[PDB]
Every structure is written in structure tokens, then in C-alpha cells.
Design a protein around this nucleic acid. Structure first.
Lengths: 48, 79, 192, 136, 126
RNA sequence: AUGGCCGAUGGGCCCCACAGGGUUACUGACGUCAGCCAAACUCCGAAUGCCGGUAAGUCCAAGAGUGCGGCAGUGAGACGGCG
RNA sequence: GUUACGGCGGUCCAUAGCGGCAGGGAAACGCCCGGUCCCAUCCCGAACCCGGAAGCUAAGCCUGCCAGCGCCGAUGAUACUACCCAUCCGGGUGGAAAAGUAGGACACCGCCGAACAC
């Protein structure tokens, strides 16, 4: 893992409009990312 | 009506100068070649133009290794 | 198809070489060699006239019973050497075979019948491969083409073979091809 | 008139005429064939004149195979020229033929017409030839 | 019925080591007075030999297999150092003081690195 | 580079759209069966020739080889046999 | 000294290769777990490096059997050829191919080291 050549990897959590929460890492500097539609929210994943 | 050909270079006198079974001093040129048709073996060194020569006195002996022609020198025995 | 071995008298060769073999031919004898599963090369000279007679009647794949200095050995004609111009027999290779042995050899193919009027019959392959017992070898095979029409391919597998005979060559070989007869318009086109 | 579409070298040494043919000494496609007996360069036109001769006699039925292809060029210097000043331009295409070589092969229902037709083709070739059939 | 499709990593690594050990072997050779020191490395041990390529015979050998090296409380590098001393003493008992190092196609560093200098300090002039 | 087998590909045609489908004395690559050719092709590959070692032979001589020196002539060749 | 075991090497380097079938994990050879340390990615602990032994013979590796694709390949004959004989054809003495056939072949040998016997 090269020292400085890489974008800083931020530990973050996913919060969705259905109340579902996910824990991961990402590039988002805020450290917390929101979303309007998720896999649970998305009708296609639910067969709708 | 004329010919556009007719140009040629000198003949370079390549070949195997020292043949198998001959006694050679140090540094004598064994083969004069262009590519590595013959490859160096034991106590045979490669020149700049792939000319082969001898680093140690002895008797020439051609041999093969890994499907490659090689030239070697056997250390003839002192009387 | 069980055939009777043909009897020939053969004598060994005192000197071998292009000097001796040429002289032997000049005497009416054809030099030959005999090797087989017994692993024993023997140099023999057969009489040319009788050898020719055996081959003319019994085909090129003839089963022989040689008499080598009083000893009877069963042999098969493996191959021949025919001079391109003189059409002699310069040399013959003989293979020893025991009765009941499977041998792989090549036999000829003949096309017998009467094709439809608007049909040209072409034989692509002269000989096909066959595995059979040494004495059960067929002298030649037959293919019948009567009333066959249009472009019909008679492949090797379609040939009917005697019992105990196997088709070593793959069936995909196209032994006989039947096509529409060329017209004078077609003849005067190809080759230009 | 058969000529190669392209050839790597256009000016070549004359093909040598020693020996007898080693390959292609036996009829393979047809039932009859013409076998050479002397060395000669069978040129491009002689093949055409002979092949036409076969077709005229057998008329409609049958097929003709030409095992000889004239891909070896031959050159001639321009007329009325002294010697020297390079090699002449290629003129005619020949195919080197040795004794034992089988040139043409003809397939036809009846034998008598087929042998006559091949005989006319022989008279258009410089070599002494003979007609040979397929069997032994 | 399982039919593996691709190269397995173990054989890719094994072949690559052999390929890059030959190109090392172009210049490195051993002799009765300057034997080649061949190194073989595995995930659990390490091995060394003194090879005389004139006739292809081995003069001395050492490895992490011997329980003496196994009983070393240290690390893999500590086992390697113990091996480096062992081959050296066996070398002097055989009458050799100068060798050449065939690193064996492994990158010179870490366990091999500890192996070479441990023998170097013990008296093996190379 | 000859003749077959299979058939992309394209020409062409039925549906007709120029999209999607099959059709043909056609174009017939790729692959494959059979038969071939090459001074500037070689998976192969002689005989002679050449380099060297050794044992002999001729050895009151081939009037031999090698080195140095004095003195030259020659440097317009022809035909025959082989490549 | 023995083994279906590890290495390092050889042979005018495939008769040793390719593929199919069955089989082995004691020490080893391995895959495998992890990225604190030496070290690394033209990005990636994939590779290289290093720390280990939870799991596995499914692979590598090894053993046995297949002439299936490749490889080697005779004797004889022929092509060619040095010399000689011969008025244009040809022949003798010596040398002797390529291709094909019979067949061979699923490698052989050397030095250390292992588990075990002694």
C-alpha cells in the first residue's frame, strides 16, 4: 500500500431513507454518507 | 537498356579456423562467425563480433549442449 | 474369404549391394527382404516371372509360402518398388505372418454398375485401409452405383466389407463422388 | 493460358533437365493419363492447345485434370541486340517435365474415345509420351 | 468431476523460480576450490549445499531440518543465522575457505540475507 | 500451386424495410483429403574436397617441402572432360 | 540398507514431450492464515518480503498403466556420387542417402539430505 499516491480512505456509514444502516469505508471526506434509495428501497431488488 | 545491379562487398573469410583435434595456444581464434552459430564452451571466450578464441592452451573439441553447438578446449596433458 | 497361400521358391543372397542387385535383376530374379514380428531380416531372391504371375492373379496384397532353402515360411507382400518407366519390380518387402494374426493393409476399390445418364462418376480414393486376418484378406472391394442421382457421396463407411474385416481408415473419406455431367460450356472454362 | 498470379523472383536460372520424376508418377484423379518420356520445357501455350484438343474430342461428358502448372519463367533479350547489358525480360512460362511425370488425366465412360482424345493431346506436346491407365 | 482451468499459483511460482534460477546459473558455477553455495528456501525451513559442478557432487550441506536449528528459540531469521554458521564450520572441516553464492533465484534479502552474512562473518570469504 | 469435402464471408433471391430469418449454376476465406514445384525454401542430407593426429610407403630420390639471398621470364591463352 | 520422499546436476538434451485413467501426504515439497517489523506494486501483501501452522491432497510434485498426438527408427532397395571402362546409350569397384516399412518408447545415471530398518 503505497504511502501518499492514494486517495485518503475514510471510514464511513451508509444511512438510507428506509432507516437501513451500513458500515464501510469510502473516499467521502465527510466521513458519513446519506442515500435516498438503497437495495432495500429499490423496487427492483424487492421484485417491484 | 542497362543493368542496375552488380554491386558486391568483399568476402569476409569467416569459417572455422581451427578444427577439432588441433593443439591451440592461448588466444588463438577458433571460429570466425557472424552470429552465434557456434557457442562458447569451456576455456573458449567470445569476442566482440562473436569471434571465438581460446583462453587456455589445449586441444579443440566440438560438442553440443541443450541442442546448441558448442566449442570446448580439453586440457591436453603435459609430457 | 479364405485364400490359399501361393507357393514360391526363394534362395538367400550371397552378396548384397547395388552391384549385386543390378546383376540379379539382369538374371531375371528380383531381390527381396523378409522381416517380421520374429525380428529376423533375411535377404532373398525370388524369380521375377513367377512373382509377377502371383501378383497379376492375386493382386498386390498376396499371401505367400516361401521355400527358403527347404524351410517353408508364410509371408505377405508388404510393399513393392516399381520403376516409373520400365514398370519392372526392382525390390519387394515381405512380412512374415502367423495364421490368425491381425494385419493392416490397403486394398483397392472398384466401382461396378450403371450410373444415371446425366451423371459423371469420380473415384477420389483408390485404396482404403483394412485390418483383417492374414488369410482372410480380400483381393479387392466393390462399390455399386446404379440409379444414383444428383450429387451423392459414397464415403468409406458406406462400403460393405466381408466378415472379420475392419475399416481402419476413418469413414469420412469420400471414395466415390457422383456429380452432374459437365457441359461443353463447363469444359472450355476450367484451365484458363 | 495458365500463368502464376505472382512469383517471388521473375528472372531465374534455366531449370535443369537431369534425372527422372520422383513424385507424381502415377495417375491419381482420372482413369487415364499421359506419361512423359523425354525432358522438355512444356510451355504455357502447349498446355492450352493440348487441353483444348481433349475437350473437342470428348465433347460434353468427362473431366480433365492438368497436373502440370507452368510457373517457371523464361527470358529472352530484345531482338537485334548485341550480347551484354543485363538479363532479358521474362517472355514465356514453362513447367519442367521429366520422364515418368504424368501430365494430363482424363475420365470418360468408354475407353476407345478416351484413348483417341488423349492421343490428339500427345501430338501437341514436344515430348514423346505414352498413355497410361490407373490399374497395375 | 472437477477440471481446473487455469495455472495454479503454486506451479506458477515453482516454474518462475526455476526460470529465474537458470538465468542466475549462467555466470555462477562451482569448483573443487570455489564450490557454489546453492540456497533453497521454503515456508518452514531453508537448505544450503556446497556443489562442485565439475562433476556435480556436493561437499557439505546444512538445513533447518536438523533439530539443533529447530530448537533455536528465535525466529526464521534466527534459524537462518544458525544454519549459516553450521555450513561454514562444515566447509572449513572440508578444507574450503572461499565460495560463490547461488542465491537460488530468491531476491537477496530477509532470510537469505541473514544466511549470507552469518556465513560471511564465520570465515567464508565471499 | 491442381482437384475434391465443409462453409464462413460477400454477390444474389423469398419475407420484402435498411432490422430480424433461409435460400443459390454463385464469392467461397478458415480447416481438411489426395497429387506436386523452388538459386536467393529447408524438418533432413550424402559422395568427393579441406583442417589436424598417427602408422607406413618411395627413400644411391621425388632430384620433394620451408626460410634468406643473386638473376629472370610471365601477367593476350586455346581446345577437350566434368559443375 | 529400504521408500508412492526432498534437493542439486548430467545425456551430442522429447526413446525423456503432450494428453487420458487410477492412486499418496510420516519427515519433507506445497497450497493456506496475516499484514506489526525488513521489503514491494509503473494501481493491487496478486507478485516479492516477512510472521505462523487453522485447514487440504482439490492442485503443484510424485508413483503405476495407456502407442492416443508428437519423438526416435533399422535391414533391404532406390536417388546421388569419387574413380574407372565405354564411339553419342550405358556399365563396374567403393561410399551411400531423404521418404516409407519392421519396430523402440509413457526415460537413464550421479552426489547430498530426509522417515525408517540396521
Amino acid at each position: 500500500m503505497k504511502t501518499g499516491i492514494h486517495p485518503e480512505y475514510v471510514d464511513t456509514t451508509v444511512q438510507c431513507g428506509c432507516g437501513h444502516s451500513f458500515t464501510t469505508r469510502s473516499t467521502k471526506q465527510s466521513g458519513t454518507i446519506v442515500v435516498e434509495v438503497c437495495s432495500q428501497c429499490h423496487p427492483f431488488y424487492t421484485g417491484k | 537498356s542497362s543493368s542496375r545491379n552488380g554491386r558486391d562487398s568483399a568476402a569476409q573469410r569467416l569459417g572455422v579456423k581451427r578444427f577439432g583435434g588441433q593443439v591451440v595456444k592461448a588466444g588463438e581464434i577458433l571460429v570466425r562467425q557472424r552470429g552465434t552459430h557456434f557457442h562458447p564452451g569451456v576455456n573458449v571466450g567470445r569476442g566482440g563480433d562473436d569471434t571465438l578464441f581460446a583462453l587456455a592452451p589445449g586441444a579443440v573439441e566440438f560438442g553440443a549442449k541443450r541442442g546448441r553447438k558448442t566449442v570446448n578446449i580439453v586440457p591436453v596433458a603435459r609430457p | 474369404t479364405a485364400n490359399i497361400p501361393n507357393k514360391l521358391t526363394a534362395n538367400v543372397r550371397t552378396r548384397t549391394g547395388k552391384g549385386a542387385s543390378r546383376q540379379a535383376r539382369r538374371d531375371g530374379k528380383v531381390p527381396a527382404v523378409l522381416y517380421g514380428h520374429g525380428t529376423d531380416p533375411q535377404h532373398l531372391e525370388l524369380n521375377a516371372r513367377d512373382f509377377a504371375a502371383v501378383l497379376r492373379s492375386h493382386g498386390t496384397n498376396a499371401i505367400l509360402t516361401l521355400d527358403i532353402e527347404g524351410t517353408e515360411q508364410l509371408a505377405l507382400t508388404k510393399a513393392l518398388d516399381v520403376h516409373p518407366i520400365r514398370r519392372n519390380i526392382q525390390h519387394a518387402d515381405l512380412l512374415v505372418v502367423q495364421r490368425g494374426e491381425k494385419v493392416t493393409v490397403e486394398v483397392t476399390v472398384l466401382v461396378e454398375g450403371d450410373a444415371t445418364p446425366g451423371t459423371l462418376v469420380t473415384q477420389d480414393a483408390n485404396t482404403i485401409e483394412i485390418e483383417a486376418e492374414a488369410l482372410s484378406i480380400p483381393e479387392q472391394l466393390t462399390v455399386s452405383v446404379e440409379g444414383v442421382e444428383a450429387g451423392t457421396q459414397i464415403t468409406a463407411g458406406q462400403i460393405s466389407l466381408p466378415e472379420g474385416v475392419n475399416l481402419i481408415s476413418d469413414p469420412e473419406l469420400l471414395v466415390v463422388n457422383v456429380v452432374e455431367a459437365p457441359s461443353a460450356e463447363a469444359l472450355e472454362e476450367e484451365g484458363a | 493460358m495458365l500463368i502464376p498470379r505472382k512469383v517471388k523472383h521473375r528472372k531465374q536460372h534455366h531449370p535443369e533437365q537431369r534425372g527422372i520424376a520422383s513424385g507424381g508418377t502415377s495417375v491419381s484423379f482420372g482413369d487415364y493419363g499421359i506419361q512423359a518420356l523425354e525432358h522438355a520445357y512444356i510451355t504455357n501455350r502447349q498446355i492450352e492447345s493440348a487441353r483444348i484438343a481433349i475437350n473437342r474430342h470428348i465433347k460434353r461428358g468427362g473431366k480433365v485434370w492438368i497436373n502440370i502448372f507452368p510457373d517457371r519463367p523464361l527470358t529472352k533479350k530484345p531482338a537485334e541486340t548485341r550480347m551484354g547489358s543485363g538479363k532479358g525480360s521474362p517472355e514465356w512460362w514453362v513447367a519442367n517435365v521429366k520422364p515418368g511425370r504424368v501430365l494430363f488425366e482424363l475420365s470418360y465412360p468408354d475407353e476407345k474415345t478416351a484413348r483417341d482424345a488423349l492421343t490428339r493431346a500427345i501430338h501437341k506436346l514436344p515430348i514423346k509420351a505414352r498413355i497410361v491407365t490407373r490399374e497395375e | 468431476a472437477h477440471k481446473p482451468v487455469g495455472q495454479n499459483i503454486s506451479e506458477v511460482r515453482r516454474n518462475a523460480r526455476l526460470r529465474r534460477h537458470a538465468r542466475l546459473r549462467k555466470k555462477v558455477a562451482g569448483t573443487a576450490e570455489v564450490p557454489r553455495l546453492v540456497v533453497n528456501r521454503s515456508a518452514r525451513h531453508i537448505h544450503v549445499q556446497l556443489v562442485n559442478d565439475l562433476n556435480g557432487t556436493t561437499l557439505a550441506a546444512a538445513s533447518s531440518i536438523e533439530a539443533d536449528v529447530r530448537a533455536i528459540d528465535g525466529d526464521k531469521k534466527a534459524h537462518s543465522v544458525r544454519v549459516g554458521q553450521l555450513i561454514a564450520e562444515r566447509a572449513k572441516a572440508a578444507g574450503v575457505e572461499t565460495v560463490v553464492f547461488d542465491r537460488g533465484g530468491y531476491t537477496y534479502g530477509g532470510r537469505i540475507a541473514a544466511l549470507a552474512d552469518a556465513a560471511r562473518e564465520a570465515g567464508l570469504k565471499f
